[PDB]
Amino acid sequence: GNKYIQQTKPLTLERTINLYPLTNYTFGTKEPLYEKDSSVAARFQRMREEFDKIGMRRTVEGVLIVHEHRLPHVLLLQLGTTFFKLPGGELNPGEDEVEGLKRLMTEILGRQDWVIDDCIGNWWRPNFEPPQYPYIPAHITKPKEHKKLFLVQLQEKALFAVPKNYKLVAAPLFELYDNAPGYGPIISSLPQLLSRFNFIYN
Amino acid sequence: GNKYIQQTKPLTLERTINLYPLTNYTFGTKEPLYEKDSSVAARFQRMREEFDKIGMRRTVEGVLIVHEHRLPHVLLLQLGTTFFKLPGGELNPGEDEVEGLKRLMTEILGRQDWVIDDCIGNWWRPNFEPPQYPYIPAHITKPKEHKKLFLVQLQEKALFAVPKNYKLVAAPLFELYDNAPGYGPIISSLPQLLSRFNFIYN
């Protein structure tokens, strides 16, 4: 004759994420962090050299979200007038994805004095060329890079240490949406990839 | 001194979905199902009339995935040369989202002789106009429509009953990706929204 109290709905169906105000977050400076590749030519030469040695490049990137006036903003690292990146980078062979992303974000943003429970997408680079796709194209059996994106939940407050040559910016979703010319195909589709989340604006 | 066997990784982090070959699926015909709105003018007039009476329109849509040669395809309903839609429609006031989507897909596709565990995105229409966004734009406190998308897991085999005036097609991700001119902003970003899933190609 008993009834059961119903379980919290699956996190697959409704995923809630706490956001905090932009003003909860601050940065201090650290020494500059220079890009591994000094040009487009060097980038693709290194990708080719490493592909021959260790196979497909495995990149991981973190999407950290804050709000201002109840609108989500994604944290980006500005390196040039039109050059923005997510905090992340290249995994070492054998390295766990999530543990690697933790290492990489400590390297880039780690204060000098991470909660990663959510995969938000995957992108693949079929050739030693710029184009990347959110799927493996037909008959591509050996992509040259696989990029995996994760949502990194921030604490209520945090201090970041930012390499001097980077500017830590908070981009509102309307800045990113349908703005591949400004931010590229991955960052510009973050609004779509974040749309399923139930955000709490603390 | 004991060690614990580790739990399956969270479904938030790695979400696996079984797909089956296109040839596992068939359709039979039923009577035609006419669009509620006969023109763009009538569409926005009805949206306005109903907004005044019952508030924001609540639409729900199902994303059903199959594969051919290990490439995902999304099922769409073709109504015209350039007019494709997802199976779904408008919720009744008070109606549960998932139960409403089940009702709507039975209406459209239900054989005459649903597993919905995943939210994949949200879109909002700020005005009585075509544009829709994957977020609520700043200072929009009363959007006119909220569209919610769900992944509908298919059984190994299924038979569909399709209104005579619709053609059931299976669209590969490369047909959709960066093809808003062909399919609109929602269907064209399905490849990005599906990229997080670990698909098993049965």
From Swiss-Prot, chains A, B:
The keyword Transmembrane helix does not apply. It is found in: Nucleus; Cytoplasm. Residues 1-122 are annotated as: Necessary for RNA-binding. One of its GO terms (biological process) is protein tetramerization. GO terms for molecular function: chromatin binding; histone deacetylase binding; identical protein binding; mRNA 3'-UTR AU-rich region binding; mRNA binding; protein homodimerization activity; RNA binding. Residues 56-176 form the Nudix hydrolase domain. This is Cleavage and polyadenylation specificity factor subunit 5. It comes from Homo sapiens (Human). The gene is NUDT21.
